[PDB]
Amino acid sequence: WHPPWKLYRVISGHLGWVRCIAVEPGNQWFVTGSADRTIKIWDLASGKLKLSLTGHISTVRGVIVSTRSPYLFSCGEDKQVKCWDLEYNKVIRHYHGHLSAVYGLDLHPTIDVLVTCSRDSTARIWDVRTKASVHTLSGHTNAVATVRCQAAEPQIITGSHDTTIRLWDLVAGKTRVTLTNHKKSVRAVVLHPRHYTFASGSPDNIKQWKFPDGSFIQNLSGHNAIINTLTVNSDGVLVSGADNGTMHLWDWRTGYNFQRVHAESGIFACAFDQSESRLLTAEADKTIKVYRED
Amino acid sequence: WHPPWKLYRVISGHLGWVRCIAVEPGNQWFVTGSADRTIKIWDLASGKLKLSLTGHISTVRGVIVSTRSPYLFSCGEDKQVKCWDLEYNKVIRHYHGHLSAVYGLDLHPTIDVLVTCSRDSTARIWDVRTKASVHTLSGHTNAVATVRCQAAEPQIITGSHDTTIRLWDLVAGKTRVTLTNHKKSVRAVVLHPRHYTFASGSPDNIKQWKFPDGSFIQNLSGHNAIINTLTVNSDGVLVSGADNGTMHLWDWRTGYNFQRVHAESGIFACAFDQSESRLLTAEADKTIKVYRED
Numbered sequence A, B: 001w002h003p004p005w006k007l008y009r010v011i012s013g014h015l016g017w018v019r020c021i022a023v024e025p026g027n028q029w030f031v032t033g034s035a036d037r038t039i040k041i042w043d044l045a046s047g048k049l050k051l052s053l054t055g056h057i058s059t060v061r062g063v064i065v066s067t068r069s070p071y072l073f074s075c076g077e078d079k080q081v082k083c084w085d086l087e088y089n090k091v092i093r094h095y096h097g098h099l100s101a102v103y104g105l106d107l108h109p110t111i112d113v114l115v116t117c118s119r120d121s122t123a124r125i126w127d128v129r130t131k132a133s134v135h136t137l138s139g140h141t142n143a144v145a146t147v148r149c150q151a152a153e154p155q156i157i158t159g160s161h162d163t164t165i166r167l168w169d170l171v172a173g174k175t176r177v178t179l180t181n182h183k184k185s186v187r188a189v190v191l192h193p194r195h196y197t198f199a200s201g202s203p204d205n206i207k208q209w210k211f212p213d214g215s216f217i218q219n220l221s222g223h224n225a226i227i228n229t230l231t232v233n234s235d236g237v238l239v240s241g242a243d244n245g246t247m248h249l250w251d252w253r254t255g256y257n258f259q260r261v262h263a264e265s266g267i268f269a270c271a272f273d274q275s276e277s278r279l280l281t282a283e284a285d286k287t288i289k290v291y292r293e294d
């Protein structure tokens, strides 16, 4: 059993769609990126604005906080990929290589690399401190909407507008497996924290798969909308956020949809805090909504 | 997904614990039995008292409405088993045979028999119109708390204080299979409407099994209290009612507990109406509580 989630706090300040959200490893603050071209750092406990980081010239599509270093990484529709030093509160590195808009990113848990995914149909692997390109993961035939890393092989998983999922060999920089089941564009991928399974979302279905080869488990059906985000906690609460503002909460193992949250409406990104007691959403109505168990 | 259930109406009138509840085939009214020794007929739409049937000298433990005839059957701790003619609103038949308190009953869907279960460790099969004993189902070593019928073999299923479930051959009047898994007294049995599976409840676990031989499927864990009742609808909503007043709602197939309803507290019996839109509970606080989807 998972207790229901209820709206606790609504955080405003952005002047356009909030496209991305991430929580720092120490759980003290969270970061958001927006269509207004800004990155904002908010205090988690209070919901107050700490800092506003400027530099992007188009929508900020991805934000992530480093565990290894006091860094924050961001990416945008302006093709820019930046490393922000959180001790100096300024950009220290630019990762050049994407041919068009950068849609998302992830950090590798064991290798000091940043992985970005783009409208250019690639995912790119960058050495954090030297900015050097490690590999350009080419194989998708359309925009790569989502990318996730893990320590175990396959180390990189991508979801694409080509309606496929690719499982990559990080060392060789090659596709190990291509999963074609989704009938429509894949915009979200989530890895279960126990490392045995993962899920992907498209309007036709949310699909659950087994590592390492991507054996299909089951469909999580009922969220008949454009799925923008998928996030899961250690307790097994899977959250699917849709472009029409709807949010479905599921039990990971059973695939059962336990809660349906009602809603320019839309949910672009979801994240749990480090304690997993708070669910933070980034929405089209220019706000961040905070949910807690009740 | 199953929408949550919320309290819609509270029906009072009984002067003691409400031990049993049943809905008529035409869905116009429902019947309850109580520790105050009365049987009450209430209008379903309004919740108003229609008739009060008197005759039992101890707690009424079971009530059921016939589909074949305009009859209502009742049983009690006074060892009495009665057939009430609903056209005349009076007792027309007494079924004699139980050696002690009668705990429950059920009607067979194809054979014109009434089945009762008792403190005497038996379940008894009675021909409705002649009152003749068809079979005395002996095999349990303690009180038989619950009994259910079905057209397919095994036609009769009993749950006992001996911690076992017995699957019976109605024709021979013999046990086909004895299920011993429960560590504690079994007080509730429910048959899934599709006829492939069934469930049983004890404080240690709610267990789900396959027909015809009772192959164990899974445990529905988390309702750590004395389970008095189990009821399921065609949509897959399983309701478990406890002696401490707690009610857990589950998805039948997955076994996932989706809702936990808070509470002399106690739930003795649960029943869905014919439309399955209403959940009616019979409680220790002397009331009938009506729940609807919200």
Ligand SMILES: [Cl-]
Binding pocket: A092, A093, A094, A095
């Ligand atoms: Cl640079």
Ligand SMILES: [Cl-]
Binding pocket: A109, A149, A150, A151, A152, A195
């Ligand atoms: Cl990992």
Ligand SMILES: [Cl-]
Binding pocket: A210, A211, A212, A213, A214, A215
């Ligand atoms: Cl596999």
Ligand SMILES: [Cl-]
Binding pocket: A217, A218, A219
């Ligand atoms: Cl499936």
Ligand SMILES: [Cl-]
Binding pocket: A258, A259, A260, A261, B003, B004
């Ligand atoms: Cl809901």
Ligand SMILES: [Cl-]
Binding pocket: B092, B093, B094, B095
């Ligand atoms: Cl008689």
Ligand SMILES: [Cl-]
Binding pocket: B109, B149, B150, B151, B152, B195
């Ligand atoms: Cl049947």
Ligand SMILES: [Cl-]
Binding pocket: B210, B211, B212, B213, B214, B215
């Ligand atoms: Cl079986």
Ligand SMILES: [Cl-]
Binding pocket: B217, B218, B219
């Ligand atoms: Cl189990």
Ligand SMILES: [Cl-]
Binding pocket: A003, A004, B258, B259, B260, B261
């Ligand atoms: Cl609940």
Ligand code: NA
Binding pocket: A019, A020, A061, A062, A103, A104, A105, A145
């Ligand atoms: Na993104």
Ligand code: NA
Binding pocket: B019, B020, B061, B062, B103, B104, B105, B145
């Ligand atoms: Na009963």
